[PDB]
Amino acid sequence: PMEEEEVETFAFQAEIAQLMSLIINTFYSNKEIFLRELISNSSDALDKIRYESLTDPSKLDSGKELHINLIPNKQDRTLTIVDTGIGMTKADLINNLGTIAKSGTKAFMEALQAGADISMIGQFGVGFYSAYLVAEKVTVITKHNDDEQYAWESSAGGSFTVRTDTGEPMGRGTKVILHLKEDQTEYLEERRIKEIVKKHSQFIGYPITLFVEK
């Protein structure tokens, strides 16, 4: 019997959409920073669950260990960043990843046309969009204590979708799946992945594990 599923389609805030287009349709050197950005956010989410749980231990019922996994997959050209942080609720997703204006956006987009490195992206608080340096399509699966597991997704172009996730239950945390663009498969190489972790994500304060298929 046929399953039904609710999809909600949202427009990105105008300047996000401008920023997203700028990321996708300009050449940038040094695109490797995208991974530093996503580890940072897991690091943030990880600090959050750690602190929130000192207030309330039961918040770790969804899992005690707080870590980041990196999962490259050469068959489907996805690199997946997994954390056991606080996760995002449906409203966390909609507000935080595209809906609500960010105050840095205009300044950063002026900083790029003046010729700053896309490295600067973190300090303007629009670092998540660096995913678009290397990915044609991003999926975010997220599970917060206070909420059901949701999937956000966007091929840029002005829009993203949210829906309840029907895939594997995660427990608590965030899964960012980068569907990588063809010319960017280097971020599937465990050599390359190790290189950039050690270069840029040195003193994130949670263990990081790379899983290599073979």
In the complex, least distance from residue 46 CB atom to ligand CMP, rounded to whole angstroms: 8
Q: Does 84 bind ligand CMP (CB under 6 A)?
A: no
Tell me the window of 54-62, 64-72, 82-90, 196-204 that interacts with ligand CMP (CB under 6 A).
82-90
Q: Among 81, 103, 93, 137, which Cα is nearest to 16's?
A: 103
Tell me the window of 25-33, 83-91, 182-190, 195-203 that interacts with ligand CMP (CB under 6 A).
83-91
Q: Does 174 bind ligand CMP (CB under 6 A)?
A: yes
Q: Does 45 bind ligand CMP (CB under 6 A)?
A: yes
| 192 and 186 Cβ atoms separated by less than 8 Å | yes
Q: Give 171's contacts (C-beta < 8 A, 6+ positions apart).
A: 62, 63, 84, 143
Annotated binding site for ATP: 41, 83, 102, 128
* Distance in Å from the first CA to the final CA of the chain: 37
The first and second tokens of residue 214, run together, are 């073979």
Q: Does 43 bind ligand CMP (CB under 6 A)?
A: no
Of the two residues 40 and 185, which places its CB atom closer to ligand CMP in the complex? 40
| 178 and 110 Cβ atoms separated by less than 8 Å | no
Phi-psi region of 83 (alpha: psi -120 to 50; beta: other; left: phi over 0): beta
Binding site for ligand CMP (CB under 6 A): 41-42, 45, 83, 85, 87-88, 96-97, 125, 128, 174
